[model samples]
Target: QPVLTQSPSVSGTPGQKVTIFCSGSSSNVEDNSVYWYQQFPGTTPKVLIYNDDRRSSGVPDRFSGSKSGTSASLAISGLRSEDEADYYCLSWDDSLNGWVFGGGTKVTVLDAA
Candidate 1:
């Protein structure tokens, strides 16, 4: 089984930047496409990045994805309050012939005091 591990959480203020990390095996991250999703509270997950670095339709340009070796990252720049959500990374596993997901990272967009 291909397992993915993600940082538990991340936070940033509006106009700031944040990154979420996902770690997996080569069979998943290196050999196959890595995808990212954003799940807002009480909403369905939406594809943010598809096929490694390509942003999905309507996804803001500030959101980006990258993969290298057995790891992948999702970065959100110029973060906004609406960006606060749970993010997840997905990839296919050849050994298991299925898709796997990271534990998920909760992004907190803090208000400027």
Candidate 2:
């Protein structure tokens, strides 16, 4: 089975940027595209990035994604208070003929202190 690991959490202030990373094996990253999701509490997840780096329709350009080697990353620029949410990465694994996901990362947009 393909497994993915992600940083447990991240935090940033409004107007700053935060990046979340995901790591996988060749079967998942090298051979398949990575997708990212943003989920708010009590709501279904929304696709933030699809097919590696393409933003889903209506997704702001401030949200970007990338992959290199066996790792992938999602970056959110111009972060806003509304941007605070859980983010997750998903990819297909040829070995398992299924999908695998990284542990979601909780992003906190701290109020300016």
Candidate 3:
């Protein structure tokens, strides 16, 4: 099965930058693009990253993505107070013909971290 994992939490001061990493099976992350999503307190998730580094239309450039080997990373720069939210990485599992999501990451905007 293609499995993805991500940090449980990350923090950064307002207007600062933060990065979250995601890892998956060797065949998954190494050969396929990873996508990132943003989920607020109580709302449907929105796509932040798609096909690796490319952001979906309408997604702010502040959200970016990259991949290296069997891992991927999402970087959120110039983060605003409203950026405090949960993030997740996604990828398709060829074996299952479906998508898989990381455990999810909670981003906290803190004055000091």
Q: All candidates' lDDT scores?
A: 0.91, 0.91, 0.86
Native-referenced Cα lDDT, model 2: 0.91
Ranking by TM-score: 2, 1, 3
Tens digit of lDDT per residue, candidate 3, span 45-89? 998888999988887889889999888999999988889899999
Clashing residue pairs in candidate 1 are none
Q: List candidate 3 stretches off by more than 4 Å.
A: 111-113
Assess candidate 1 and give its TM-score to the true structure: 0.95
Estimate, for each residue in 1-113, the C-alpha lDDT of model 2 and write its tens digit.
32889877999999999999999999898779999999999999988998999999999999999999999999999999999999999999998888898889999999988
- What is the overall TM-score of model 2 with all chains considered together? 0.95
Q: Could you tell me the lDDT of residue 49 within candidate 3? A: 85
lDDT tens digits, residues 1-113, model 1?
Answer: 32899987888889998989999887788889999999988999999999999998899999999998999999899999999999999999898788999888999988889
Per candidate, the number of residue pairs that clash is 0, 0, 0
Estimate TM-scores for all models: 0.95, 0.95, 0.88
